[PDB]
Design an enzyme around this catalytic site. Structure first.
Site, mmCIF file in Angstrom:
data_model
loop_
_atom_site.group_PDB
_atom_site.id
_atom_site.type_symbol
_atom_site.label_atom_id
_atom_site.label_comp_id
_atom_site.label_asym_id
_atom_site.label_seq_id
_atom_site.Cartn_x
_atom_site.Cartn_y
_atom_site.Cartn_z
ATOM 1 N N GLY A 1 17.684 13.585 74.183
ATOM 2 C CA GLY A 1 18.356 12.549 75.798
ATOM 3 C C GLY A 1 17.125 11.720 76.385
ATOM 4 N N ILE B 1 16.510 11.969 83.179
ATOM 5 C CA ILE B 1 16.704 13.486 83.480
ATOM 6 C C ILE B 1 15.811 14.021 82.298
ATOM 7 C CG2 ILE B 1 18.020 15.849 83.393
ATOM 8 C CD1 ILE B 1 20.380 14.693 84.429
ATOM 9 N N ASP C 1 22.491 11.609 65.361
ATOM 10 C CA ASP C 1 22.788 11.570 66.377
ATOM 11 C C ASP C 1 23.617 12.549 66.696
ATOM 12 O OD1 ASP C 1 25.471 10.642 66.643
ATOM 13 O OD2 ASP C 1 25.409 8.525 66.156
ATOM 14 N N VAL C 2 24.155 13.203 67.202
ATOM 15 C CA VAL C 2 24.979 14.421 67.521
ATOM 16 C C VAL C 2 26.598 14.464 66.743
ATOM 17 C CG1 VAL C 2 23.795 15.450 69.563
ATOM 18 C CG2 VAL C 2 25.933 14.027 69.882
ATOM 19 N N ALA D 1 30.821 9.358 77.187
ATOM 20 C CA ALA D 1 32.209 8.632 76.495
ATOM 21 C C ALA D 1 32.474 7.484 77.054
ATOM 22 C CB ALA D 1 33.158 9.634 77.934
ATOM 23 N N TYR E 1 34.852 10.081 87.052
ATOM 24 C CA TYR E 1 34.512 10.636 86.148
ATOM 25 C C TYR E 1 35.087 11.118 85.595
ATOM 26 C CZ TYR E 1 30.725 13.900 84.931
ATOM 27 O OH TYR E 1 29.603 14.542 84.117
ATOM 28 N N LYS F 1 32.584 18.577 80.646
ATOM 29 C CA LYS F 1 31.485 19.028 81.691
ATOM 30 C C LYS F 1 32.007 20.186 81.101
ATOM 31 C CE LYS F 1 28.452 16.040 81.376
ATOM 32 N NZ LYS F 1 27.292 16.706 79.739
ATOM 33 N N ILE G 1 21.926 10.837 90.540
ATOM 34 C CA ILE G 1 21.076 10.193 89.582
ATOM 35 C C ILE G 1 21.043 9.057 89.244
ATOM 36 C CG2 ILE G 1 18.898 10.364 88.612
ATOM 37 C CD1 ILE G 1 18.649 13.115 89.074
ATOM 38 N N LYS G 2 20.272 7.718 89.144
ATOM 39 C CA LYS G 2 20.507 6.481 89.001
ATOM 40 C C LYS G 2 19.895 6.304 87.335
ATOM 41 C CE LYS G 2 20.329 2.382 90.642
ATOM 42 N NZ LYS G 2 19.573 0.986 90.406
ATOM 43 N N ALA H 1 23.078 5.570 81.623
ATOM 44 C CA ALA H 1 24.628 6.108 81.597
ATOM 45 C C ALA H 1 24.919 6.051 83.095
ATOM 46 C CB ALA H 1 23.967 8.145 80.953
HETATM 47 N N1 LIG Z 1 22.560 10.843 85.809
HETATM 48 C C1 LIG Z 1 23.073 11.706 86.889
HETATM 49 O O1 LIG Z 1 23.316 11.394 87.474
HETATM 50 C C2 LIG Z 1 23.390 13.520 86.192
HETATM 51 C C3 LIG Z 1 23.699 13.941 86.945
HETATM 52 C C4 LIG Z 1 24.582 15.604 86.493
HETATM 53 C C5 LIG Z 1 24.365 15.384 84.968
HETATM 54 N N2 LIG Z 1 24.068 14.473 84.291
HETATM 55 C C6 LIG Z 1 23.811 14.806 82.447
HETATM 56 O O2 LIG Z 1 22.848 14.497 82.224
HETATM 57 C C7 LIG Z 1 22.370 14.531 80.633
HETATM 58 C C8 LIG Z 1 21.881 13.730 80.458
HETATM 59 O O3 LIG Z 1 22.042 12.179 81.401
HETATM 60 P P1 LIG Z 1 21.046 11.112 82.006
HETATM 61 O O4 LIG Z 1 21.427 10.635 83.343
HETATM 62 O O5 LIG Z 1 19.817 11.783 81.735
HETATM 63 O O6 LIG Z 1 21.174 9.479 81.076
HETATM 64 P P2 LIG Z 1 20.583 8.720 80.346
HETATM 65 O O7 LIG Z 1 21.815 7.509 80.044
HETATM 66 O O8 LIG Z 1 19.109 8.035 80.425
HETATM 67 O O9 LIG Z 1 20.715 9.836 79.103
HETATM 68 C C9 LIG Z 1 21.769 10.247 77.968
HETATM 69 C C10 LIG Z 1 21.072 10.748 76.547
HETATM 70 O O10 LIG Z 1 22.457 10.165 76.139
HETATM 71 C C11 LIG Z 1 22.103 10.155 74.973
HETATM 72 N N3 LIG Z 1 23.483 10.188 74.236
HETATM 73 C C12 LIG Z 1 24.612 9.197 73.922
HETATM 74 N N4 LIG Z 1 25.464 9.336 73.108
HETATM 75 C C13 LIG Z 1 24.398 10.298 72.532
HETATM 76 C C14 LIG Z 1 25.012 10.952 70.296
HETATM 77 N N5 LIG Z 1 26.301 10.262 70.002
HETATM 78 N N6 LIG Z 1 23.817 11.643 70.260
HETATM 79 C C15 LIG Z 1 22.355 11.500 70.349
HETATM 80 N N7 LIG Z 1 22.194 11.125 72.028
HETATM 81 C C16 LIG Z 1 23.206 10.681 72.683
HETATM 82 C C17 LIG Z 1 21.184 8.613 75.233
HETATM 83 O O11 LIG Z 1 20.803 8.842 73.851
HETATM 84 C C18 LIG Z 1 20.672 8.895 76.286
HETATM 85 O O12 LIG Z 1 19.071 9.059 75.467
HETATM 86 C C19 LIG Z 1 23.874 14.108 80.361
HETATM 87 O O13 LIG Z 1 25.191 15.123 80.366
HETATM 88 C C20 LIG Z 1 24.735 13.308 81.755
HETATM 89 O O14 LIG Z 1 26.323 13.818 82.257
HETATM 90 C C21 LIG Z 1 23.472 12.809 84.985
HETATM 91 O O1 LIG Z 2 26.978 13.576 83.782
HETATM 92 C C1 LIG Z 2 26.522 12.277 84.818
HETATM 93 C C2 LIG Z 2 27.190 12.030 85.927
HETATM 94 C C3 LIG Z 2 26.882 11.642 86.996
HETATM 95 CL CL1 LIG Z 2 26.873 11.377 88.568
HETATM 96 C C4 LIG Z 2 25.854 10.355 86.232
HETATM 97 C C5 LIG Z 2 26.119 10.401 85.173
HETATM 98 C C6 LIG Z 2 26.581 10.889 84.098
HETATM 99 O O2 LIG Z 2 25.933 11.088 82.890
HETATM 100 C C7 LIG Z 2 26.935 10.583 81.829
HETATM 101 C C8 LIG Z 2 28.239 9.320 82.512
HETATM 102 C C9 LIG Z 2 28.861 8.871 82.045
HETATM 103 C C10 LIG Z 2 28.980 8.488 80.954
HETATM 104 CL CL2 LIG Z 2 29.438 8.436 79.829
HETATM 105 C C11 LIG Z 2 27.886 9.447 80.016
HETATM 106 C C12 LIG Z 2 27.001 10.098 80.795
HETATM 107 CL CL3 LIG Z 2 25.415 11.272 79.972
#
Ligand SMILES: NC(=O)c1ccc[n+]([C@@H]2O[C@H](COP(=O)([O-])OP(=O)(O)OC[C@H]3O[C@@H](n4cnc5c(N)ncnc54)[C@H](O)[C@@H]3O)[C@@H](O)[C@H]2O)c1
Ligand SMILES: Oc1cc(Cl)ccc1Oc1ccc(Cl)cc1Cl
Ligand SMILES: NC(=O)c1ccc[n+]([C@@H]2O[C@H](COP(=O)([O-])OP(=O)(O)OC[C@H]3O[C@@H](n4cnc5c(N)ncnc54)[C@H](O)[C@@H]3O)[C@@H](O)[C@H]2O)c1
Ligand SMILES: NC(=O)c1ccc[n+]([C@@H]2O[C@H](COP(=O)([O-])OP(=O)(O)OC[C@H]3O[C@@H](n4cnc5c(N)ncnc54)[C@H](O)[C@@H]3O)[C@@H](O)[C@H]2O)c1
Ligand SMILES: NC(=O)c1ccc[n+]([C@@H]2O[C@H](COP(=O)([O-])OP(=O)(O)OC[C@H]3O[C@@H](n4cnc5c(N)ncnc54)[C@H](O)[C@@H]3O)[C@@H](O)[C@H]2O)c1
Ligand SMILES: Oc1cc(Cl)ccc1Oc1ccc(Cl)cc1Cl
Ligand SMILES: Oc1cc(Cl)ccc1Oc1ccc(Cl)cc1Cl
Ligand SMILES: Oc1cc(Cl)ccc1Oc1ccc(Cl)cc1Cl
Lengths: 255, 255, 255, 255
Positions: A12, A19, A63-64, A94, A155, A162, A191-192, A195
């Protein structure tokens, strides 16, 4: 650091605001050896720079969505590492209309399948694939969000996945617990990130949490990173099947 | 009764020990008009007898795996009813190895997809399809299990699906809430049904709950039936997005 | 009604807007025989009118702070009823500064003791005192609030007491469960009652819940009343140790 | 270590088997300066040895039942430290019949008051008293148990108190959050300590947890100690209002 000699694979990591990036930085600081995955032939360059940045030459495509790449991932890692100490599942996806506006408007069997395929199934899938080369005190970590436990605007379908992801944390913990492996999730605050841009009115969410969270501030990938490093270390050998909130306490209040 | 004049569609009625059967009996008793669904050309006879048994001639085929049958279901129902007051989602399925022995042993991308497709997605899917003919005080009800919230032996992949199902209850509640529709789930305790036979050592679970539940007794489809009738009625117009335990209180203890 | 022949004692009926009043109306409608309690020599007149309004001549003084009045309550009730089927605990109190402004500002050992004495201890206390004359299918009901599970502005010390109250529901359920008695709570949404006036900016809370609840509306003592009648009836014989939200689904969302 | 330069006050250190002792050892290892409290004129000797064992000369009497001793505690500490970085609340008590056999048998208004006075109120009480000399990144920690969330045999009245304690964690987190102070609890699994001896059939609980927890092992004061050290450190600056399970994952399963 408290991760000296630990070998950790991180998924990721897409940008320096990811993150997974925060977790990587914290893990390296605490003395771990890191390995990374990327999606798509193209991103290989960008992730190799990141890997080199953390003193690693180990990058593998995964690619999962593809069973092939998953099995190949750990076959390849095994030629460099014969023992895996940590696995960071920081993956989610999604179709964009499934996380925009009304829950039902964006609901289709395909959108549902994809969201759960990539965001939920992939975690225990990777776990199953890594099992043969997992150490006895190995630690698996995934990322979740409050939207799994309560209904959060936009969401939508991601929330369902989730919830499944968090349930898998528990069933995984039981399955791998005998061997001595621990499985946890961090429920991170907003977190900005890249995704995050796909979630409609994400800025409203950031403003609201900053205003209403007990600490009156948003969290950083550093704070999530540290929490993650802890859970991956022997310091948390008593902790498993846990969903730990790293969100400045937002989940515990009514805003 | 407190359901006089309510039109309710029930899925999942397979045998006279089915949970849906219990709910059906209770709803009829409280004065509702019922309609039923069945799966597969063959079961049409058996379900028609049941329907007649509850004073209904309305039976429709609906394999929730097929988008066609789902859309056709409410198209057909619309020719008899112009208004739907209640929808009972009493449906679940996973490949049998996915709910036997170890969680990981039974985990495959296909088993995962199927379980979530049939047990989770189908609920909001039916909801979306029924939306056009739903009354303003309509109530939707689904069935869940403690396995969604805690790791229960053998429940495995079904636990993940149920967690998603419970999450959809909440997001559905928000989406349909504006219109005035309520969405709830009953977390039922173990009941000796047809599907229950596929859960390994189900008898151990029955004995354990009977021994350790606060009421020191297992629940019946009549007790789940009555609770369901309540949630479907105007008596519960203040209740939505709720997961109600009907399990003799078992969830609240450590056995 | 589904409460025909049930004898139910209600505490907490203070005004026609009281939650206890809502529960009483619903119980009478469903066919119960009611008995009431009041606090202080003075309110005897007002409560007797209410009792007569529900076709009852049974009113007894009971300040739950006094062990004497509690034991005397059921000694007196026993001269009219030899069997008690239902007990409604609709009682709460804390010194007003303990539910105003900052949590720590209003915190004193005395304020803490009082809040828990009257709002938490009194429930299992009344239960213990009533045990000898409780029927085997008896049902005990108490009222709680979301503030027990999440931090709500101004609720402060009351939140702690409610958390203890909800815990007592569970331990009570185990203790009385063998005999066949059920113990439950309703987590009611905000309702403009006498006590509600003591919560700072209660109006802000009403507006917020109306705006953000899935049903986009506040709840009534009729809706809570109906839910209560259900839990007190044999319709809910499968339900115990449950905290049921009657709040238009507000608890399940992030506002 | 990750606690270099942090000044931490620990309560509840009674023997080398105490949870507080485990936490003390971990904090010292990570580089904190420690201060300790003891109860009763007599234990002064035993606790001074322990303090010396951790390189501290700072011991203060504090029976949390007495407002006097609580205020005096921080007045005295202020003469040595002008800034407190950490507070460890490892204190609990109930009259022994209140945690033996049946919940109702051991229930008395006095037993109730005492249990909540010492086990629940004391935490926010100590917090309020320490507020003036708390640093802006201070961290407060308390110890709770699964009995707060589910009914556990013999835990009885203690369960209610722990529930209140966990609620106070949340309201404390909000009150002190503005300043930047974090408040958390660790829900520890069973550990053979002095206090544990007073819980009837504590051995049955240890055996059951060892057999049914995902990690198939009980936890140690070292494992709870490490988790505690983490929560007290800046590594957990994103964590507040959290109840973290350190119990080998026992809470997440059905045994
Ligand atoms: N950013 C937030 O505010 C936030 C908050 C809570 C939870 N999360 C969760 O944290 C996790 C990481 O997201 P992030 O915010 O660090 O974002 P990010 O968008 O920088 O990275 C998300 C990652 O998912 C990977 N990914 C998506 N589809 C994939 C696939 N088919 N195969 C392999 N990898 C794939 C992308 O390559 C990317 O590296 C996610 O599950 C997201 O829901 C994010
Ligand atoms: O889970 C998340 C939660 C928050 Cl608050 C912000 C980003 C997040 O991460 C995603 C949000 C939408 C899609 Cl399509 C994919 C991912 Cl990984
Ligand atoms: N039986 C229990 O002890 C128990 C406990 C808790 C929850 N539940 C839930 O209650 C619900 C009802 O199950 P039950 O135990 O009463 O059993 P049951 O086996 O009598 O009914 C299950 C139903 O699922 C239907 N179904 C399966 N695949 C389907 C598909 N593709 N399309 C449409 N329908 C399909 C079957 O036709 C059947 O009628 C399920 O969701 C189950 O998870 C059951
Ligand atoms: N109104 C709301 O929005 C709301 C929401 C959630 C929970 N509740 C709970 O509902 C319950 C009843 O509140 P209500 O809103 O119906 O209020 P109400 O203000 O009309 O009544 C409060 C009651 O407290 C009782 N009482 C106070 N001290 C007592 C004592 N020492 N002995 C016996 N009785 C005593 C009185 O009989 C009185 O009827 C309380 O437990 C309250 O916490 C209310
Ligand atoms: N030991 C376990 O299995 C376990 C598990 C989970 C949670 N806990 C909780 O952890 C905390 C410590 O328990 P432990 O097992 O480490 O025990 P321990 O018995 O060694 O310590 C308990 C402490 O309570 C303190 N205490 C008692 N009465 C007091 C009073 N009047 N004023 C001030 N302090 C007082 C004493 O100083 C004593 O050291 C308690 O809150 C307990 O509920 C214990
Ligand atoms: O969900 C259930 C929970 C319990 Cl305790 C017992 C039976 C259940 O019902 C099922 C169990 C397994 C499958 Cl594959 C399908 C269904 Cl419907
Ligand atoms: O618990 C309550 C919750 C809400 Cl939203 C409204 C009223 C409530 O009832 C009380 C509030 C404060 C005090 Cl001192 C006493 C009582 Cl009975
Ligand atoms: O909370 C606890 C939980 C467990 Cl499993 C063991 C000990 C505990 O702690 C106590 C239990 C009873 C009393 Cl009287 C005092 C304390 Cl400190």
């Amino acid at each position: 650091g408290f991760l000296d000699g630990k070998r950790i694979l991180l998924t990721g990591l897409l940008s320096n605001r990811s993150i997974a990036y925060g977790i990587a930085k914290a893990c390296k600081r605490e003395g771990a050896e890191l390995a990374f995955t990327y999606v798509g032939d193209r991103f290989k360059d960008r992730i190799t720079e990141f890997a080199a940045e953390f003193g690693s030459e180990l990058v593998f495509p995964c690619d999962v969505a593809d069973d092939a790449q998953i099995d190949a991932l750990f076959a390849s890692l095994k030629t460099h590492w014969d023992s895996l100490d940590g696995l960071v599942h920081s993956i989610g996806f999604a179709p964009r209309e499934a996380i925009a506006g009304d829950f039902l408007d964006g609901l289709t069997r395909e959108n549902f399948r994809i969201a759960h395929d990539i965001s939920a199934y992939s975690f225990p899938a990777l776990a199953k694939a890594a099992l043969p080369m997992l150490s006895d005190d190995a630690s698996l970590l995934t990322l979740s969000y409050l939207g799994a436990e309560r209904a959060i605007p936009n969401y939508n379908t991601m929330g369902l996945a989730k919830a499944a992801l968090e349930a898998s944390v528990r069933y995984l913990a039981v399955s791998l617990g005998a061997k001595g492996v621990r499985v946890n999730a961090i429920s991170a605050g907003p977190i900005k990130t890249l995704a995050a841009s796909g979630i409609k009115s994400f800025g409203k969410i950031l403003d609201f949490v900053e205003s209403n969270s007990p600490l009156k501030r948003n969290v950083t990938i550093e704070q999530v990173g540290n929490a993650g490093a802890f859970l991956l270390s022997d310091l948390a050998s008593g902790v498993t099947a846990e969903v730990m909130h790293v969100d400045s306490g937002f989940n515990a209040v009514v805003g």
